[PDB]
């Protein structure tokens, strides 16, 4: 359930990161047994990226990818995947091209290896001359995506991405579609506005990112709310933890801050984050209790491995190189780190485990 404000309320008034790449299978590879080959790219900015899955020196034809989302530091992440049956002779790799790379990078597949939250992420990237900006919105409950919207897709509707949200009727999807299009119109106007506030050329591509949501404890009571904004991967304006004042990053954001303090925008957001957001999060937790209220403990086994766990939050410490937690593609997550002992903290564990 998204925010429902008028477009003029969030009216604005006035650094490249290279991707980390991981190639892996969803399950442990067995020759002759069907599996999924994954390429996980994360930590990159801007969002424009080209990813191929390779089999024996050529491109795999039917490769799908997840909806574009970003982390707390505004860097993007994507999962590219395809169904495959590995054999002894076949060799697989992932190729990634990005503005930060002087040539495409190839990473080969090594065959031999509580609290709750609702979040909404919005990304708008301008394409001068090629039309309106590319707009993608995604909604999360914990680490489970449940809705999405792509401006380039054919439906022009908010679409389900979890089984439990398909229960909702047409009135829900009509309202979500209407609201997500209003989020898109606001972001498009902001892209044109922000180019003027920074005196930038009309030919360059720029990115606007918006995030908001709410946390609740194990008692499903409100803990914290968020509402943050970024331009080209850098903090622009953010609502503080008290949800009553703004953090502006530069002089252009200070003018928006004063326009938003006078028009009382923070008060309209706090009503949503403390009320509506919490209310519908509890509705989602109830309707998807078989999915959302589960915890899968990591199957564990110098390299400490942790597989098939949910939620994604985990801690692996050696008593050193730790990879970013990665999606298996089936709702679970994976991670590993590199006299000695390995400590594993996870919500699905009674007490921290120790691997020697």
């Amino acid at each position: 359930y998204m925010l429902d404000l008028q477009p003029e309320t969030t009216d604005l008034g006035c650094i490249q990161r290279t991707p980390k790449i991981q190639v892996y299978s969803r399950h442990p590879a067995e020759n002759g047994k069907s599996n999924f080959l994954n390429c996980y790219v994360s930590g990159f900015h801007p969002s424009d990226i080209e990813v191929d899955l390779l089999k024996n020196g050529e491109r795999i034809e039917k490769v799908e990818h997840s909806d574009l989302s970003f982390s707390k530091d505004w860097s993007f992440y994507l999962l590219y995947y395809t169904e495959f049956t590995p054999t002894e002779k076949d060799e697989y790799a992932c190729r990634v091209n990005h503005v930060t790379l002087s040539q495409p990078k190839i990473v080969k597949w090594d065959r031999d290896m509580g609290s709750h939250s609702m979040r909404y992420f919005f990304t708008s990237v301008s394409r001068p001359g090629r039309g309106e900006p590319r707009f993608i919105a995604v909604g999360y409950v914990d680490d489970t995506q449940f809705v999405r919207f792509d401006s380039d897709a054919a439906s022009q509707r908010m679409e389900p991405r979890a089984p439990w949200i398909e229960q909702e009727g047409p009135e829900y999807w009509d309202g979500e579609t209407r609201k997500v299009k209003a989020h898109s119109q606001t972001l498009r106007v902001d892209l044109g506005t922000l180019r003027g506030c920074y005196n930038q050329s009309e030919a360059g591509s720029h990115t606007v990112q918006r995030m908001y949501g709410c946390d609740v404890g194990s008692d499903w009571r409100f803990l914290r709310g968020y509402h943050q904004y970024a331009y080209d991967g850098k903090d622009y304006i953010a609502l503080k933890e008290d949800l009553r004042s703004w953090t502006a990053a530069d002089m252009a954001a200070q003018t928006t801050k004063h326009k938003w303090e006078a028009a009382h925008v923070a008060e309209q957001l706090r009503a949503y984050l403390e009320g509506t957001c919490v209310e519908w999060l509890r509705r989602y937790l109830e309707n998807g209790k078989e999915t959302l209220q589960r915890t899968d403990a990591p199957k564990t086994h110098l390299r400490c491995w942790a597989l098939s766990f949910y939620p994604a939050e985990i801690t692996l410490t050696w008593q050193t190189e730790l990879v970013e937690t990665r999606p298996a593609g089936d709702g679970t997550f994976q991670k590993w780190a590199a006299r000695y002992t390995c400590h594993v903290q996870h919500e699905g564990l009674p007490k921290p485990l120790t691997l020697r």
Partner: nanobody
Amino acid sequence: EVKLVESGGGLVQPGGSLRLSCAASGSIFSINTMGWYRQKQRDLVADISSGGSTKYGDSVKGRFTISRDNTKNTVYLQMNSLKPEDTAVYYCYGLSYSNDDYWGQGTQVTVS
């Protein structure tokens, strides 16, 4: 191990055309996909597998055509309706059947 011999670049008037060609050395068993990138980053222009499966970058779709000799490991790029924004160094590249990439030195293409 593998050497890529490029040819066919140079100067051309807007609207004109050029044919690039890239020949791979070594065994015919050592190269699968062949194609071109063009140039911070370098962008995909066109590539083709040994079986004839092609892929084109969006900015050259319709105007550029890549083809391959069945006998040798040699590919050709027919670049039609060239624009000033097509000016770049075009790098030939190839992929071994173990996903090792080989890169040529590149050929400058300039459109007046």
